Every structure is written in structure tokens, then in C-alpha cells.
């Protein structure tokens, strides 16, 4: 694998912060003509339709020691192919061994 991901992360985390992560509940009022008489949504709709690159699609987070598409342990943040020297040596709290 290549070390190509940070050159995308640096533009795509901000793309998400500006055009995704704080734009989800907006969908429940942006198109409603009964919920507003003030003109407030037309202009931010024209802004929200500007980006065309990634956010929910074309972009996966990938592991940190290698940008592999899979093997990321969701509630731990580590790759299952770069964890054995820590896991075996008792470096993750609460995991026990051996035989059960």
C-alpha cells in the first residue's frame, strides 16, 4: 500500500465539517415552505449544492500505520494486522488471556 491518504484527509475532513456533519437535520426544514416565511434556506441550498467530491461516498477513513481499506477495530481504532505485539503483551486494558 501507498501513503497517499493524508493528502485527501486534510481536504476531506473540512469538506465534511462544512458540507456534511452539520447539514443532516437541515434537510428536515430547508425544503419546507410552511415552516418558514423568512427567506433563509434558498441561499444555503445554493451553497450546499456547491461540493461534488466525497463526504458519505468515495471516501473511507482507513488505518493509520497502513491505509488498508479493512481491518479497523471500530471501538478500539487499531488495525487487526498491526496490534499483536501490544495485545499479547497486555497493553490494552481489560483484555485477558489464556484459555477460556
Amino acid at each position: 500500500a501507498k501513503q497517499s491518504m493524508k493528502a485527501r484527509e486534510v481536504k476531506r475532513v473540512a469538506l465534511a465539517d462544512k458540507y456534511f456533519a452539520k447539514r443532516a437535520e437541515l434537510k428536515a426544514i430547508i425544503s419546507d415552505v410552511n415552516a418558514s416565511d423568512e427567506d433563509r434556506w434558498n441561499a444555503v441550498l445554493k451553497l450546499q449544492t456547491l461540493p461534488r467530491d466525497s463526504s458519505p461516498s468515495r471516501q473511507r477513513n482507513r488505518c493509520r500505520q497502513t491505509g488498508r481499506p479493512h481491518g479497523f477495530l471500530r471501538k478500539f481504532g487499531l488495525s487487526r494486522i498491526k496490534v499483536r505485539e501490544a495485545a499479547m503483551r497486555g497493553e490494552i486494558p481489560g483484555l485477558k488471556k489464556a484459555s477460556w
Partner: protein, 98 residues
């Protein structure tokens, strides 16, 4: 009026923390209900056994998350004022509710 929670990943460490709670909150006022053990949320944590070309075997680890409520009945905020200051060693989480 108020109640507490204690969490850990080990049976002997949560006892070693219970020994501090009874000494920190349950002597003045003197509180007599003993500690129930509660479920440990037993589960296997699993990953592929080898980093290359094997997907057939998995490495087995034992996970437990222990809970103690210890029980308090004195309504005063003074019941927890020292427990929110004293040890309580590293490896456990305490919580004050209501």
C-alpha cells in the same frame, strides 16, 4: 436522594476499589447494605490468528466489565464529597447520580 456506580475490567481490582468506597462513604453515616456482585458482561474479543493468508482461525481473548453499585441511603451531598476527592486507584471509573 443520591446514588453511586463503580466500573472496572477486573474482579480483584473492583474489590480493591470497593474497599475504598466503604471506607470513604459508608461509615459516617453508617450504611449497612452489603455489595451485590452483578453481571460481568462476558464476551469473546476476536481477531484473525495470523496477519497473512490465513482467515480460518481466530485468536481468543476474554473480556469482562464489572459493576458495583455498593448502595448508599444517606441523602446529603456530604456522602460523596470525599469520594470525589480520594483514591480510588487507576483502572476504575466512579459515577455520582441523582
Amino acid at each position: 436522594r443520591i446514588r453511586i456506580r463503580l466500573k472496572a475490567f477486573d474482579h480483584r481490582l473492583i474489590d480493591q476499589a470497593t474497599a475504598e468506597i466503604v471506607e470513604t462513604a459508608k461509615r459516617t453515616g453508617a450504611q449497612v447494605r452489603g455489595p451485590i456482585p452483578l453481571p460481568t458482561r462476558k464476551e469473546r474479543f476476536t481477531v484473525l490468528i495470523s496477519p497473512h493468508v490465513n482467515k480460518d482461525a481466530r485468536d481468543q481473548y476474554e473480556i469482562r466489565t464489572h459493576l458495583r453499585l455498593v448502595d448508599i441511603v444517606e441523602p446529603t451531598e456530604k456522602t460523596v464529597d470525599a469520594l470525589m476527592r480520594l483514591d480510588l486507584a487507576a483502572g476504575v471509573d466512579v459515577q455520582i447520580s441523582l
